[PDB]
Every structure is written in C-alpha cells, then in structure tokens.
Amino acid sequence: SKVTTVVATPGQGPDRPQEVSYTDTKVIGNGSFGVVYQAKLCDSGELVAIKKVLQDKRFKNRELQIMRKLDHCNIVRLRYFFYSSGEKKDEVYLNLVLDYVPETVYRVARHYSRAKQTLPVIYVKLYMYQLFRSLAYIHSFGICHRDIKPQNLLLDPDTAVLKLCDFGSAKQLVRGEPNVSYICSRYYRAPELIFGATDYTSSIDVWSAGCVLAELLLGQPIFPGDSGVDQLVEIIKVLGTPTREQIREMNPNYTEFKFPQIKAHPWTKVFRPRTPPEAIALCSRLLEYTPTARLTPLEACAHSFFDELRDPNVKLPNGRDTPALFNFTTQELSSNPPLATILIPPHARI
Ligand SMILES: COCCN1CCC(CNC(=O)c2n[nH]c3ccc(-c4cncc(OC(C)C)c4)cc23)CC1
C-alpha cells in the first residue's frame, strides 16, 4: 500500500518529534471517540494501533495527558502522537500511535464459551493478576479507568501478557469535584453508579474487575442487565437487596426504585461445583455493595488465589515461563508498601 509519512512526538520524554512512516492501514474499531486502525511501521516492521480522534485545536486532550504519564508493562504503550487535518475548517484529528496486541480477553473467553469449556484457572489467575497490577499503578496517580471490560483487556496469547487499553473514559478523580454516574459499560457498572452517585472513587474499577473475574469463572457475564435500571435487578438477584446502610455508603442521588426484598444467593452456588474456593472468596471481596469494603487492587494481587503465580516452578501451558509478575516499583506499592513481603516471593527479590 501507499506509505504515510508523519512527524510524530514520542509518548515519553521531551517534545522532540521524529519522522515516522507507516503503511497497510486497516480499520479495526470505532466508537464515540472516532476510529482505531491497525498499521505497520515501515522501518521496523512492527504492527501498531492508531487511535484517531477529532480534537478541538484550542483545548487539551485528556486521554493524551494521561497516556503521556503512564509507563507500565500491563498498560498499552503510547509510542507516538501526531496531528492530522480533515477536509473542513478547523477539523483537526489527534492520532495516538500505540502498541498492537493480537488478542483480547473477550475473544479468548468467547473461544472457550463457544466450545462449552471453561478457561483453565491458570489463565484466570494470570489475566486477573495483571489487570489488578495495572489498576494498582493507575490508581496510585489518582486515575480511575472507568471502562474496565474484557474488550479493553488486550493479550498476547504466546506470552500471556495482558495490557489495559482505552483511556478515553479515564479521569483523575478529586474528592469534592463531581463526576458523571452514567459511566462504564453496563454489565461492569458498579452499583453506586446505578444509584446515580456523583461522589465515587477508584473502587468502581475494582467492581468492574470483579465482574471480569466472575465472567471468566462462569463462562458468561454474571450481571447481564438489559437496561440501566435492570442492571441493578441482576446484581440484586445475586447479592440480595442492599441494606439501607449499604445504600447510604453508595452516596446515591436517588433510590426510589421500589425494589422487592431478595435474599442473597450464596457465592458457592453461583459458580460451577469445581470452582476453586479462593476464586470464590476473592470474588466475594470485589463484588461488595459498600465501595470502601472492596479490596484495593494491590490487596487483590496479594490474595491467596494468586499463590500459584508466586510458585518458583510455575510455567505457562505452552511450556514457556510466566511474564514478569513481581518487578514492582515504589510507585506501584505506594498505597501499602508492607504488602511487598507477600507480593514479592523469595526467588523474585532483589
Ligand atoms: C485481521 O483481523 C485482526 C482482528 N484483531 C482483533 C483483535 C484486536 C486486538 N487488539 C487491539 O484491539 C488493540 N491493540 N492495540 C490497541 C491499542 C488501542 C486500542 C483501543 C483503544 N481505545 C479504544 C479502542 O476501542 C475499541 C475497543 C473499539 C481500542 C486497541 C488495541 C487486533 C485485531
């Protein structure tokens, strides 16, 4: 195909643009944001994703500012960004050139569902552990992703590396500064949001992660609501009716749903009989009504459900070694540095 040459600015480091050539553009996604393409870097031959968004010339793109400060093995990397012009007065596009990753958790999970099989729990551990690490990192800056779902969990199936993508809903949450409640993808939406809360925290992402974990264990979404309000009905069918205290802790803006009383369905009867007890226990501490009762991402990483990953003999099913799971920086551990003793086993220590 015809080569495109641009002058692009590196994601990290000082603003020093470089000539970049790419080719073989292919549309691979769209949304309210604009369009995402696959492309191939001419010089190195590496595939990349290019996220193209209409951007107002006189304002700053929030996703860009967030992407320029993130540097983590479980977060898709911003290689470069550049501006391109459309065929209209002041029609400017921001182009984000990101790492290409060949699969998603959604796609992998679906393969197992269609074959009427469960994803082996080793992959559930690996994928969930890496999601929680990515969340521990972004939360340490005060950034809440606000769109955790299987479709935004990229994976390389050969190395089992997971990378979080799509920071178009991400935001630095500030105590006392309101936020919109109609956020996140419905099935993964925290109950406080359904109650119209505008004063919420990063614990909304932990709820969404819990929904991902349950989905990988069940073979299908645990809370498949057909509307914003029916989402709460689905949650209630498992968790039971929230108490008045639990409702208060969710900081709701309305609660006039007039829900009939429903008993909680026991967590052990939700999943198949052979589900590991530690998976169930972890899940019960993520999917909690009271936001502050939920595990932090770092505490989730230290859960006994991930003990297999801390074993020195662990290997991937393809024979290869596990990716780097314990190379925690001081930033990643800042919420609770004493957890390093559990998070970093003897053989991984330096
Ligand atoms: C020949 O056919 C192959 C099809 N194949 C199917 C899986 C696919 C997985 N990879 C990615 O999505 C992928 N990689 N790097 C990214 C970097 C950014 C994004 C991304 C960021 N913000 C919003 C997005 O919105 C979509 C959710 C609509 C996507 C995705 C990505 C590879 C293409």
Author numbering: 35 to 384
What does the paper say about this structure?
The INDZ core was previously identified as an attractive scaffold for the development of novel GSK-3β inhibitors. Through in silico and crystallographic studies, it was found to bind in the ATP binding domain of GSK-3β enzyme between the N- and C-terminal lobes. In addition, R1 and R2 substituents appended to the central core are oriented towards Arg141 in the external solvent accessible part of the binding pocket and the inner cavity in proximity of Lys85, respectively. Compounds 1–6 showed outstanding GSK-3β inhibitory activity in the nanomolar range, with derivatives 2 and 4 being the most potent of the set (IC50 = 4 and 9 nM, respectively). Interestingly, both compounds 2 and 4 carry an isopropoxypyridinyl group as R2 substituent, resulting from 3 to 5-fold more potent than the corresponding pyridinyl analogues 1 and 3, respectively. Here, the piperidine chain was solvent exposed towards Arg141, the INDZ was anchored to the hinge domain via the tridentate H-bond interaction, the pyridine formed a H-bond with the catalytic Lys85, and the isopropoxyl group faced the ribose binding site. In proximity of the ligand, a network of hydration sites was found involving residues like Ile62, Leu132, Thr138, Gln185, Asn186, and Asp200. Interestingly, MD simulations (see below) highlighted that the isopropoxyl group of 2 might be also involved in additional water-mediated interactions, justifying the boost in potency with respect to the pyridinyl analogue 1. Taking advantage of the crystal structure of 2 in complex with GSK-3β, we ran Glide Standard Precision (SP) ligand docking and Molecular Dynamics (MD) simulations to evaluate the binding mode and the stability of the new series compared to the related INDZ compounds. The calculation indicated that the INDZ core has the strongest H-bond potential in all compounds, with a very strong N-Ha donor.
